[PDB]
Amino acid sequence: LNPSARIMTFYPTMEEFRNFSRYIAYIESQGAHRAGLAKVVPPKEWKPRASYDDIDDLVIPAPIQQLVTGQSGLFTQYNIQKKAMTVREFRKIANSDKYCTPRYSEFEELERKYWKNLTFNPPIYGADVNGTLYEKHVDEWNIGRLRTILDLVEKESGITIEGVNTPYLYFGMWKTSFAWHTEDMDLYSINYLHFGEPKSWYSVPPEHGKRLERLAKGFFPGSAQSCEAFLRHKMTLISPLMLKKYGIPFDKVTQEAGEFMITFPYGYHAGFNHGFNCAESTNFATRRWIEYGKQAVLCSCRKDMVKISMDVFVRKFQPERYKLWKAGKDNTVIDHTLPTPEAAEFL
């Protein structure tokens, strides 16, 4: 509902494209971060892989069938594990008459069908598959080696976590989706669409994110009492109509093949896949994320929930505040509009 929280898309030059962290700083100087979601179109000359011809034999070890229950625009999604399969088998199912994309004339019709048939004919989503489709030598925006301060966790403490500091492959089909969530530890996210049908995203500006979770708490009270950050479980789906009804601002955007998508700290997002496709994703950070990580509210009802130590980041970047924070008396309040400090060159 806010003009200044609106999703921006960018068309960098090759020269601009070669330095990732700098260009992230640049889009923050343009206000992109304020929408919680930015789209980056890479130059025509850039290809992360010569061909996708050699992936049909690839294995999806733990495919999931997404059963959805709910009504009146509120839903809960249960991920049921399925037998491992290859991308060939998965492709057979994805283009089948039962699971193929429905016929439509405009995007709005496909959105209507998505929210209309969400709970019917549950699709299989090949989510969370370890791997990268980048060629190892490619230095331009290689999700496998993004080289940003997040590496402190692996370089400073040698801790390996799937998806956050390692690349993740997502093989989608029609009606597969991701619930309303922010990254673990409220980090940044990078998502590249290698090939296939589009993926559509809903975004809520971080400035209003608290409102959203407040609303969520009200509509899933029994879930909220068990865990305050129950949205971290990525099981809650909320419809655009319901956001408008309760005055939550949001934007939407459609991501096509060969395009990049960036989520910014504390930017709630959800979405769904138009058809058979493949994406590669990881998390990343800037200096501005540090405060976000210090104040991140996490799930406390799971053993394996992602909890990262912020000690080293503070010591390396906020020494003047370190001992006070480790003391626990640090009450700095975040301003979501502020671009990252690495935009000094800009601004």
């Binding site: 733990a62 999931i64 999604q77 991920n79 594990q81 989503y125 989510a127 969370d128 799937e162 998806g163 956050v164 993740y168 997502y170 991701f178 619930a179 969530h181 673990d184 479980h233 990525k234 099981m235 799971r302 053993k303 394996d304 929930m305 992602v306």
Partner: peptide, 8 residues
């Protein structure tokens, strides 16, 4: 199981 796509 706990995985990033969510609770499994």
């Amino acid at each position: 199981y706990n995985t990033k796509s969510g609770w499994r």
